[PDB]
Amino acid sequence: VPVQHPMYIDGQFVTWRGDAWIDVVNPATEAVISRIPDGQAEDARKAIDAAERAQPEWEALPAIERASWLRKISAGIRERATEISALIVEEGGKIQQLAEVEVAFTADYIDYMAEWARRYEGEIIQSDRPGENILLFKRALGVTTGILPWNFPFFLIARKMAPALLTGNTIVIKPSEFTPNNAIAFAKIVDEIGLPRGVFNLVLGRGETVGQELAGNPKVAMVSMTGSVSAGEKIMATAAKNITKVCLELGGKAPAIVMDDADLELAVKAIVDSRVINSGQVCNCAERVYVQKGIYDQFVNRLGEAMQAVQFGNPAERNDIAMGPLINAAALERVEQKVARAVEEGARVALGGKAVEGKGYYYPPTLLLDVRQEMSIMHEETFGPVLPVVAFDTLEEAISMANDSDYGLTSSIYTQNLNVAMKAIKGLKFGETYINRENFEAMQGFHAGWRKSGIGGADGKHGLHEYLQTQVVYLQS
Amino acid sequence: VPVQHPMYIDGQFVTWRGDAWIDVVNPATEAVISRIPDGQAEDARKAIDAAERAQPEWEALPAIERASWLRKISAGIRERATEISALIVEEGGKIQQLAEVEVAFTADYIDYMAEWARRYEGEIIQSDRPGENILLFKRALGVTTGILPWNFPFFLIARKMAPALLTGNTIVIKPSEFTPNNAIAFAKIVDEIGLPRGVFNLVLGRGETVGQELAGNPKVAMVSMTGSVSAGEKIMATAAKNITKVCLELGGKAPAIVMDDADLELAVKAIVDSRVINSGQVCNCAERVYVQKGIYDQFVNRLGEAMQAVQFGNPAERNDIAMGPLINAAALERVEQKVARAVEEGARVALGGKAVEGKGYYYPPTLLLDVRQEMSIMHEETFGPVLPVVAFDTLEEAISMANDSDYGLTSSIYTQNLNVAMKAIKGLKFGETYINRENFEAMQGFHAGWRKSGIGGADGKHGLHEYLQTQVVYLQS
Amino acid sequence: VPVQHPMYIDGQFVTWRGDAWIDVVNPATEAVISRIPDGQAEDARKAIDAAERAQPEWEALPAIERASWLRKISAGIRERATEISALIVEEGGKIQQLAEVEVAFTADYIDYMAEWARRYEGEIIQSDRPGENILLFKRALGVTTGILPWNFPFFLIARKMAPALLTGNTIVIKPSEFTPNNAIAFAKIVDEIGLPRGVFNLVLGRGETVGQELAGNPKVAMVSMTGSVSAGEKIMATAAKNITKVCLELGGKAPAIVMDDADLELAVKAIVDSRVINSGQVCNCAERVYVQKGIYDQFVNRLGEAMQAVQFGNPAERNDIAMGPLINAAALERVEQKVARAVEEGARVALGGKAVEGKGYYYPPTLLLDVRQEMSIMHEETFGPVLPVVAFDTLEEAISMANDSDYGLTSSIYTQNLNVAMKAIKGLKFGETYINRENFEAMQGFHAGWRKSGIGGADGKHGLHEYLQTQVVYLQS
Amino acid sequence: VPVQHPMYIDGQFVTWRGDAWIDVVNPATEAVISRIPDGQAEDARKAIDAAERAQPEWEALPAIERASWLRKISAGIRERATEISALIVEEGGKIQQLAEVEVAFTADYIDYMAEWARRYEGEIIQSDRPGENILLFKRALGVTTGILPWNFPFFLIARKMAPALLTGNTIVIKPSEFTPNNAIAFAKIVDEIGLPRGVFNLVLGRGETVGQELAGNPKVAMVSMTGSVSAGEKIMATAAKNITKVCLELGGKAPAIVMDDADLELAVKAIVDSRVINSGQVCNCAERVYVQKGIYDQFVNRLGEAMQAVQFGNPAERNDIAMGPLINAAALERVEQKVARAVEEGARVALGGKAVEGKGYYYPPTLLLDVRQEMSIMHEETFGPVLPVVAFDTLEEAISMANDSDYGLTSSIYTQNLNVAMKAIKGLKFGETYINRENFEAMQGFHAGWRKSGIGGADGKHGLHEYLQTQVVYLQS
Ligand SMILES: C[C@H](CCC(=O)O)[C@H]1CC[C@H]2[C@@H]3CC[C@@H]4C[C@H](O)CC[C@]4(C)[C@H]3C[C@H](O)[C@]12C
Ligand SMILES: C[C@H](CCC(=O)O)[C@H]1CC[C@H]2[C@@H]3CC[C@@H]4C[C@H](O)CC[C@]4(C)[C@H]3C[C@H](O)[C@]12C
Ligand SMILES: C[C@H](CCC(=O)O)[C@H]1CC[C@H]2[C@@H]3CC[C@@H]4C[C@H](O)CC[C@]4(C)[C@H]3C[C@H](O)[C@]12C
Ligand SMILES: C[C@H](CCC(=O)O)[C@H]1CC[C@H]2[C@@H]3CC[C@@H]4C[C@H](O)CC[C@]4(C)[C@H]3C[C@H](O)[C@]12C
Ligand SMILES: C[C@H](CCC(=O)O)[C@H]1CC[C@H]2[C@@H]3CC[C@@H]4C[C@H](O)CC[C@]4(C)[C@H]3C[C@H](O)[C@]12C
């Protein structure tokens, strides 16, 4: 019997009284593991209202006390890490080891964010007026909402709530209807440690219903959403009605540039890891490789073996695999279609390229060759273990092609040449550029994508300041 | 014969070939002073494309060289200050002295922004990985657009372009169709000093046409618009289609709090100045006064005389007036209606309250009494010399009422009590709080409004950073 | 039998082989509680050399790993807090409750400093040269030394070592020969948790011997010393020989200004607390009070009762006292002499003013009246529970007199008037100004005294940066 | 007839009444060009007192107004640039072109520093106490003194006074007795533009007399001195008596590392330029070269020709030379001795190595080979056009040897390898590291040397903050 999850509103779990439910299916077995309410905008309003009530008294607390609350939550996470991990594996369909780190990192991330308590600073600005003091304070926005993705559902709860709460905001989070269980568990921890009512709220439902309310409710100061570009378009358009601030993370088509002088083994590992992780279902995954011709042959051959070596299976039954299934049937069909589009445009399927037909949504690691920069596969985000490769002559070309995208979240380049590195740094129009290593953001970095990849960012000091606004005081006395 | 202005695109003035024109009328005499093209989206695209072409080579220039270009423009402004001022007075209908400062301040503002060249810093972040360097660079967004207002048309050209160009962005500006002449003059200066083609572009037309293109063109990194809330809604909604970043300044209903222990003379002057300036046509104008009961009588009487003393006339024919006419007929009718709405709701018209019937759009300073916090006049932005006054008992009430608004740009309070001041600072949910002085932002402050007052901000370091984005480089080597 | 303490050098406790020892006497009972080696410069060199060897590999560790080491130490402190407290009480002669907070705060302070790991930032500066990158890195100084005081011996170990180690420096600490036991205990914890050898070293001895070496050894990057002005003079003079950086905290004569409109009860409590704490043996203690005439009478009377109510005794035998004995006989005699000097100059002894004759070094709370600004008692730091009071007319006078000092560490003022506050803030030439509260620095503040009070500072971000230096890299490639 | 210069004290030039004078001799012709007073400590006190009187009212001025004063001075410099240049050439003995840039850069430097007016920020720190505000203000130190060097006498006036005055400090400057004329000219400009009396003061005399007073006068907040290490030792030791803050720039032995993969032509030019500039009389001059063996031969040969091509002469009579004479006879003899010491230790004199015997103090460019790392010539600063070269095997060795010095101001390395660069950056313990370019600091960088090279620094934001201190306000209200 799959559990029927309640939403968490105003400091308590509230059982759903509606008739409609959303089935949460295991992407590996297609079994229904649980059901969440097919929430309505009304449910989002209640949470938003509770969030609004709590905000004043929450921001009035000294920052160190808000931090203290965050630490109780992280400690709560660690005590149930294995259990949380298992939930991620089940509904997310990600490999055990990855679920384990997500959970562990989430707790550390929260603890790290809590350390900002006594550190985000306001400023005292010199005035041209004698006897005047210009004090610029950093204040909370108020009520914030978070629309989470399914690829890293647990971490993203923290990615948004930790910085939000620390700075004195309250939040109403909507997890992805595909992966709500880990969120329910996060709520249980929040409830158990007694976090003040209304500071953290979890509503459940679809994006067109619950999500939209979290972006269109006039009481919301900022809606932080992570999802598809089109979804971000719908979210920002809605947030526009009330001039609501948006913080968007909409994916990418992260290019990887391999120079002739690249540490070939290093590059192949970084790229494969960066591409095969979570079955390529990450916004900063290496989605397109540019290999300089001089090294194309040996590199593509090495890259080919590596990927062909990537094993995939049911994460709950194997800990020797690198990939689990894709999130759902639609996702699988989406990947198959894009690969077909690639073939149709003239691309060559080295290995893989055919979705497994059977229980679950598995897609084999895929290497696409004879790809031309103009091919859709090089522009549209795949979100699957598919890797197209294009050869280039000069750095200028690689840079030019890497920049030829509506996405600008992550980029990577492997070289040992100083000038090439500096030129790539300067030329690459991306929010992130990894040099001689895999695409894994640090919690103290700034994961903010250029162009359509998003607006605003997450992590680090700047992620923290996304939840802070200013009050310039002109004191004359 | 009114001059037919050409747009400034890709380093040159381009004569309009369309048949439709927009008349630019003098708000004081209703005479047509000039005509601008009824530009189309196509015209905005050409400018945007030119802006895109120039951007790479513009950002490649050392910051100090971009600054050098800004200084040539400011110097250009000063050489023609009187002429520019006259244009502002004519089309803007603002008093000579105010036009003079706008022009003078604009030049200083540009020079000030240019000084950021060698100062906006990137960051070197500690990494948890041995041998890794985390370099966070500040980069330009690329192509930015600016939709300017008519109240301070000249300054706002600089408010957006100076920080934009300094940081390496290129810009396409659309002035308000009501006040384009000063913008044309700004373009002439830009053209005369030889600013690289495509870095600064001026397109002319309506907001639903030209404005929309500047917000919806996919090549635009960020659209910076200053106008009405509803206009901001339309702009952000459009910018949403391409996940374009928005920087919005949409007005306010700036509350002014007068405590019993306030320097009465100081408060009356600050508020009147802050309210009557530009005929109350400023977003940070004192739009609603809260006077503690103990001082209500003497204060309201003093305030009454002050405002009644405010003279208004045709700015081109008098330099002894404090106000000019409102921007246009619609604006006038809007103010009359809101005052009527006030009366209808129970408000009392002390003095003024009746638009002059005749050539021009003049509205007398107006004091509204017997106002209740729930009255529309206390929520809807007036943008006219109308001043409603509400009495209150405690600070808590004044704060509560001040915060009771969809606008949160500016706020002010007059007191001599430490605790009252600190409590007001902490309690006031505004981007700006003036204490014992008039509402005039410093160029080194941060004019960023809360709630519907806007998104992002202008001026100072933070205004400058609105035009900067980040590139986090994870260097391993 | 008093324990003979060994020094802690290069990761291990080393037994003293010399013949001379320093007796550590209980300031309350005059009993010998322990003995430490009468260390020689040679002993300081060994520690410095070990510190130098370890530095490279210590700074090579990721900051988060150094932080991890700090946290092990703080956790170690907490597990033995009661025991550490008891040692402080015994050798320091401070009241149990104060020893308890010192220990508790020390651990929190260390944990707080460890949180800077991923936060101290370098900077990327814009260059006037095309293709150039200016990278300003923050690096450790190298080997640093710390000469600790006896008033807050335990906390100061952390005040210097935590920020030092986090930033990648190694340190050689010399506790005060009067209070080394708590330091030995800190070393035991460091040793037990396995902190890399040479990173933390504890040498024992006198200042003219061991202390001098820690300031004059050419391998020392910076000597951080907290003590008497004359001692600081000797330390800086020595550090001069090798152009060694100094961070000095040399005490103060913290003035307290009470305005007529001050919350009298609040002021009396703040001042007494700030003065009687640790028997007035703190650099930021209220050492001189300026009371506006209008409130002089009632205030001085209230202040008098409060102080007369302050009980003092043997901290190990009573937890109902506010003060313990002074550090030693010399200290006691110093206070008696200064009070006598006060009387001789014309001062009036309200209450107290006579050192108890007997076992221990107790001095009663003392209130001095009929004091003139020029009296020595108003300039020379007392470091005893003696409180001189001077009446003044205007704020200007209070400010002027407060500033009339070679010390400029801490200052305080009690008022409810905005202007008085702002004028005091602006006029007071001090590193710290408390307004309507007692003089207790926050760990996130910046305890850095002006004038002779010191050079550099402690605590917060700026305290942390005292242990960091810069490396500006001009990269052309 | 050589002019007898007066000192500039308290807003006016004061004629010397003493009997003793110091002859200012032209290093190229040995002719007496002028005479300055053999000032006494008393003269320094008068200036310091005037500086103290003016300080309060100077700091009370809005920062932008202080900046305005700086700009008047820079503009004054430019109007007399040629004349100032000529003076530098005459007394400094530097080539016309270098004197010209010094003057031009000085003016730009001052203008740049003035731009900090509205930019140095204080901070608002979060407190653990409810209702408390922690405001950290940046205040001036008060009275500061500057002991200038003779190598870049004009620039250093600005390097110290510009940041000092902008932040609200007043200053008393002592130029080098060898090069006071340019300082007198700077004073004339200051006097002509009407800078408030006492804000800028110029005293003349020797270091043991006037200099010492500027470091030992108890009214001095900070003494900023640039000179020899031993002089810095005497200055800091003196400043110690009153716990006066010191900012010292004491020279260097800047190492240059040439890797096998270095752009040989680029490296030879950078190093020669960096070494031959001002006849090698600069603290950041390349003073020792480390060439990897693989490229040693071709590099040393190229380097040899380059240096042999460096022409030197009387700067007033030739504009085709790269070097002028050394500052004075003692300097010349010092260089000859050090070269002899090199030869005696086993070094080989490729070319030059023999001071010209005749009118003036000329020393030919000198290349020393067969140098061993332990040779004095590789440790003692030469301050002459002498260049020792050592061969090395690995980067590790070059780094190790570069770090083997009491000086740590500047360092440089030429390579095209990413890892080598990053390793050099990380390994080089210097305040500056130039990569593939000559050693010329940017005004927005931070010229602060490690180890004995100095304490504190100059230029940029951090140079500016050397003249700023903090006042942490704990506001409770
Ligand atoms: C086709 C059935 C499923 C439905 C049926 O009973 O017919 C079986 C037979 C082949 C099976 C696959 C074999 C390769 C993989 C082994 C992994 O360790 C788990 C996932 C995969 C992808 C398996 C998934 C599923 O277990 C399949 C597809
Ligand atoms: C009504 C005519 C205009 C049209 C006509 O010819 O009838 C005149 C008569 C009264 C005039 C007003 C008198 C008061 C004001 C004097 C100011 O110095 C200019 C603006 C005002 C508000 C004038 C505007 C205009 O000049 C009016 C309104
Ligand atoms: C109306 C008189 C002027 C005419 C007269 O002499 O009566 C006064 C009253 C209020 C004055 C304004 C106050 C705010 C501004 C102060 C600026 O530093 C200069 C421009 C402004 C905009 C002033 C312009 C002018 O000085 C006004 C409008
Ligand atoms: C004088 C003897 C000590 C020596 C002797 O045996 O004569 C006794 C008698 C009076 C004693 C004091 C009484 C007042 C205090 C009581 C406190 O709870 C502990 C400290 C004090 C200050 C005591 C210290 C010491 O215990 C004294 C001074
Ligand atoms: C030796 C006399 C000077 C004294 C005398 O009359 O004997 C002359 C003869 C050789 C002369 C030198 C020749 C080479 C250089 C030519 C430069 O353009 C100026 C500096 C030098 C270094 C000259 C300096 C001086 O002019 C010298 C040394």
A421 interface with C at CB cutoff 8 Å: yes
Q: What resolution in Å is listed for this PDB structure?
A: 2.5
Tell whether D161 and D297 lie within a shared domain. Answer: no
Q: Which chains are adjacent to chain A, needing at least 3 Cβ pairs under 8 Å?
A: B, C, D
C136 lines ligand 4 (CB under 6 A): no
CATH classification of the domain holding A273 = 3.40.309.10
List the single residue in C406, C448, C470 with the smallest CB-CB distance to D470.
C448
Nearest to D233 among C243, C406, C470 (CB): C243
Tokens of A370: 């004879």
Question: Are the C-beta atoms of D69 and D400 separated by less than 8 Å?
Answer: no
Q: Are residues B246 and B256 in the same domain?
A: no
Q: Pick from C95, C279, C356, C363 the residue to mutate for probing ligand 4's pocket: most ligand atoms within 8 Å of its CB.
A: C356
- Choose among C280, C333, C337, C281: nearest CA to C310: C280
Report which of B2, B26, B43 is spatially closest to residue B174, judged by C-alpha positions. Answer: B43
Cβ–Cβ < 8 Å for B7, B37: yes
D139 and D283 co-located in one domain: no
Between CA B100 and CA B87 the distance in angstroms is 10
Q: What tokens were used for D343?
A: 């030869």
Q: Which two structure tokens, joined as six digits, stand for B233? A: 């809604």
CA distances in angstroms from A136 to A67, A471, B170, B442, listed in the order given: 23, 6, 29, 12
Closest Cα to atom 1 of ligand 3: B322
The amino acid sitting at A323 is M
For the record, the structure tokens of C393 come out as 């007319």
**CB-based contact, C124 to chain A, within 8 Å:** no
What is the per-residue DSSP string for B324-357? Answer: ---SSHHHHHHHHHHHHHHHHHT-EE-S--S---
* Cα(B404)–Cα(B421) distance, integer angstroms: 19
Using the beta-carbon criterion (under 8 Å), do C123 and B121 form an inter-chain contact? Answer: yes
Q: Do D118 and B443 touch (CB under 8 A)?
A: yes
Q: Please say if B249 is a catalytic residue.
A: yes
Q: Does A118 touch chain C (CB under 8 A)?
A: yes
Element (H, E) at B138: strand B133-140
DSSP state of B380: S
| C266 neighbors C413 (Cβ within 8 angstroms) | no
Kindly give the distance from the C-alpha atom of residue D25 to the centroid of ligand 5, in angstroms, as a whole number.
17
CB-CB neighbours of A193 under 10 Å = 13
Looking at the CA of C360, which ligand is closest?
A: 4
How far apart, in whole angstroms, are the C-alpha atoms of residue C333 and residue D332? 59
> Residue C421 in contact with residue C427, Cβ under 8 Å?
no
Question: Residue D47: which of D180, D262, D217 has the closest Cα?
Answer: D217
- CATH code of D117's domain: 3.40.605.10
Q: Within this chain, do residues C236 and C273 fall inside the same structural domain, yes or no?
A: no
Strand partners, B174: B147
From B94, B312, B362, the mutation candidate for ligand 2 (largest count of ligand atoms within 8 A of CB) is B362
Same domain, D231 and D321: no
B341 and B454 share one domain? no
Cβ atoms of C255 and D259 closer than 8 Å: no
Q: In angstroms, rounded to a whole number, what is the distance separating the alpha carbons of residues B343 and B346?
A: 5
**Is the Cβ–Cβ distance between A307 and A268 less than 8 Å?**
no
Same domain flag for B212 and B256: no
Interface A:D, Cβ pairs < 8 A: 85
Q: Of the bound ligands, which one is closest to the alpha carbon of residue D332?
A: 5
Closest by alpha carbon to D296, among D384, D365, D380, D371? D371
CB proximity under 8 Å: D 14-33 to A: none
Cα–Cα distance between A185 and C464 in angstroms, integer?
39
CB contact under 8 A, B474 and A442: yes
Could you tell me which of D210, D188, D211 has the C-alpha nearest to residue D200? D188
Verify that C293 and C428 share a domain, yes or no.
yes
SS (H, E, C) D142-194: CEEEEECCCCCHHHHHHHHHHHHHHCCCEEEEECCCCCCHHHHHHHHHHHHCC
Which chain B residues are within 8 Å of C419, Cβ to Cβ? 416
Write out the H or E segment, with its range, that includes residue D249.
strand D245-249
Nearest CA to ligand 1 atom 13: A313
The number of folded domains in chain C is 2
CA distance C396 to B159: 41
Tell me, what amino acid is at C450? W
Within this chain, do residues A5 and A67 fall inside the same structural domain, yes or no? Answer: yes
With an 8 Å Cβ cutoff, are D477 and B421 in contact?
A: yes
The sign of the torsion formed by the CA atoms of C173, C176, C182, C184 equals positive
| Ligand lying closest to the C-alpha of residue A313 | 1
Q: With contact defined as beta carbons under 8 Å apart, do C408 and C453 qualify?
A: yes
- Supply the range of the domain harboring residue C122: 1-251+443-477
Residue A249, marked binder: yes
Cβ atoms within 10 Å of A31's Cβ, excluding its own: 12
Distance (Å) from the alpha carbon of C63 to chain B's nearest alpha carbon: 7
- D397 in active site: no
- Whether the Cβ atoms of residue D381 and residue D251 lie closer than 8 Å to each other: yes
Q: Is the CB of B311 under 6 A from ligand 2?
A: no
Count of H-run helices and E-run strands, chain A? 14, 23
Q: Of B122, B125, B456, give the one whose Cα is nearest residue A455.
A: B456
Tokens of C470: 């810069």
- By DSSP bridging, strand B3-4 and strand B32-37 are parallel
Same domain for B276 and B216: no
CB C187, CB C160: distance < 8 Å: no
Residue that the structure tokens 């080919």 belong to: A304
Distances (CA, A) of B26 to B41, B173, B276, D137, D453: 27, 22, 20, 48, 67
What is the strand order of the sheet A12-14 is part of? A12-14, A7-9, A200-202, A170-174, A143-147, A222-226, A245-249, A454-455
Q: Provide the chain C residues 433-452 that lie in CB contact (below 8 A) with chain D.
A: 433-437, 441-442, 444-448, 450-452
Question: Is the same domain home to B60 and B109?
Answer: yes
Contact A303, A286 (CB under 8 A): no
Residues 257-296 of chain C with CB under 8 A from chain D are none
SS3 (DSSP) at B306: helix
On whether both A146 and A218 belong to a single domain, the answer is yes
The answer on whether A334 is annotated among ligand-binding residues is yes
Residue A201 has phi, psi (to 5 degrees) of -135, 140
> Does residue A12 come out as left (phi exceeding 0), alpha (psi in the -120 to 50 range) or beta?
beta
User: Distance from CA of residue D118 to its chain's centroid?
Assistant: 27
Separation CA B83–CA B182 (nearest Å): 9
Cβ atoms of residues D291 and D259 within 8 Å: no
Q: Which residues of B touch C136 (CB under 8 A)?
A: 124
Is the CB of residue D358 below 6 angstroms from any atom belonging to ligand 5? yes
Which letter, b or e, does each residue of D422-455 get, where b requires 16 or more Cβ atoms within 10 Å of its Cβ?
bbbbbbbbbbbbbbbbbbbbbbbbbbbbbbbbbb
- Say if D469 is an interface residue toward chain A (CB within 8 Å): no
